[PDB]
Design goal:
part of a larger assembly, 4 chains, Non-ribosomal Peptide Synthetase Peptidyl Carrier Protein, Chain A, 11 helices, elongated, Capsid protein p27, alternate cleaved 1 (chains A, B, C)
Chain lengths: 216, 216, 216, 76
């Protein structure tokens, strides 16, 4: 076992402190420090250092839930890269959370007994839990294009709020289109209305508006 | 698979944040981080981090279109470095966008199944898409030299607007010359007109005007 | 051929005059007078009498478009109840609009040559055209529950505006739910938020809110 | 590069003047059409500018631009 550099961890902690949990740069940095498969000890200490107390509690909860979903999928398929072929290799949550025998508090023994599939599953679970907590900590039908705001900023904000919401995946594109049409102050509303072609995708609407927009 | 440094990615993101998408320094930095052939995962996460939401949507669109042009050229020539000789090596867009089987979300498997020709084609496509989106997101025949403006500022502005426009590459120098001659308020107009030598290059015109300009 | 009673037509015209084109009572009355299969003469004169000049022009347009869709489906299936088995029974738009030979201006000859399948197709086409024009003549993301408005009125208005809009059919229920949650002033918002059960249907949300609403 | 469509001038006169001055100039033959197009787009006072901008089709020839503008021009 080799620990992560405290210099990288300090830089990541200051990034989370200034930019927040949800910025794309912060998620990119987390993906960077989430490159090699980490042991439960590593991810646990990392989240202890970079996250405050309350986000850390939320993250522990979310990580447990995601690991439980993983273990349900594992008992639903004996071919999990964390599992084995016989029943003696079935992976318990004590082994995933680092609570099993020979692992509690010892990262060396942890790295000894853990499987690479176990490590990558733990890592993906922790990443998804971080995403959930970031989306939770700090409304798409209330988004309007400001009188002075450009259109690409409005589109970015709207697509962000629509994709990071409780809608089904198959209902995001129609909602984004119909919000482009009814929000996006009446100059762009009329620009989209008088489209000789039929625009059936947010990307096509964005391209059309960027082409024919009133330069100002 | 080895990930790109989050330090380089953070520096590139701040470069894009301060200089913009279209500055030559930004394009040089992107070319730098676009040196080794990247996997679809790498380029996708890179554009997710450095670009905002709306430019990222535009870039996904443009990348898809360019990859489709590449696949049309590939079905138009069985000797593509991404293709093979038999029909069983034909490359589908699911394999280019990283959507094929054994690749979705897994960069290791991605790096396993992908060809180097596939990687370089994906990389060139992503670079061209970035160029398109940068030209799209944020007029040379309307540029006049102000009454109080110096000549080097006017020349900088004019050359910038002419080279960053929709003209062919072989039509920029004559246009820059003829705009130096007709814009550039009548003192410099007469200074260029009464040139005992024939000036046939923007650099030569700039040198001549800087030599014989009215110091004031 | 037997004409429709001018008394019923006068009552229907006054209904359209007072209630409008889109009221459910008006559509019910139209469905009532659209019970027996009508000849093109009957429907044409009926719409001439009950509709004003501009709605009548719109309705002629829409009726033509719907009849053209019907004739496309008819040439796409030789088993149309208006068609026959051989090619000599194929139904042209002149026969549907009453413009064919032996039919122009004569309702008796019309009733003679027309098929019952022709009549029912014409009738359904005219009904759909009336619906289109009614929806067109006199915004769901702008609907709020007023401070004094009851919840069933708000739900009626919202479901009406969402179903009579440009959304796909598979995107109406999620939009109605998410509009119940974000509109519907904060008392009902908190009432829906603190639902011990998960409500996954507009009807279930309406039932829950009607049960636990603050009687006032 | 100094040709503008006057406030009262028609569009065919402006197009005639511009094509005359561009073809009777020192540009290479392969650079006249793009210059004429980009001068139609940036000159030709903002009503026609917006008329050309909001073209559902892509106009890639001075003749096509002239035809489109003559079709959809504001009769006055």
């Amino acid at each position: 076992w080799t620990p992560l550099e405290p210099k990288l961890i300090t830089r990541l902690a200051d990034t989370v402190r200034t930019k927040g949990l949800r910025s794309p740069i912060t998620m990119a940095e987390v993906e960077a420090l989430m490159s090699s498969p980490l042991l439960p000890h590593d991810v646990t200490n990392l989240m202890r250092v970079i996250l405050g107390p309350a986000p850390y509690a939320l993250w522990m909860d979310a990580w447990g839930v995601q690991l439980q979903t993983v273990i349900a999928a594992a008992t639903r398929d004996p071919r999990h890269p964390a599992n084995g072929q016989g029943r003696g290799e079935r992976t318990n949550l004590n082994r995933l959370k680092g609570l099993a025998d020979g692992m509690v508090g010892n990262p060396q023994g942890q790295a000894a007994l853990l499987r690479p599939g176990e490590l990558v599953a733990i890592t993906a679970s922790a990443l998804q839990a971080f995403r959930e907590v970031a989306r939770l900590a700090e409304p798409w039908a209330d988004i309007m294009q400001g009188p002075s705001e450009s259109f690409v900023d409005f589109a970015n904000r709207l697509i962000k709020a629509v994709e990071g919401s409780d809608l089904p995946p198959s209902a995001r594109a129609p909602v984004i289109i119909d919000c482009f049409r009814q929000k996006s102050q009446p100059d762009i509303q009329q620009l989209i209305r008088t489209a000789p072609s039929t625009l059936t995708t947010p990307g096509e609407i964005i391209k059309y508006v960027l082409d024919r927009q009133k330069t100002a």
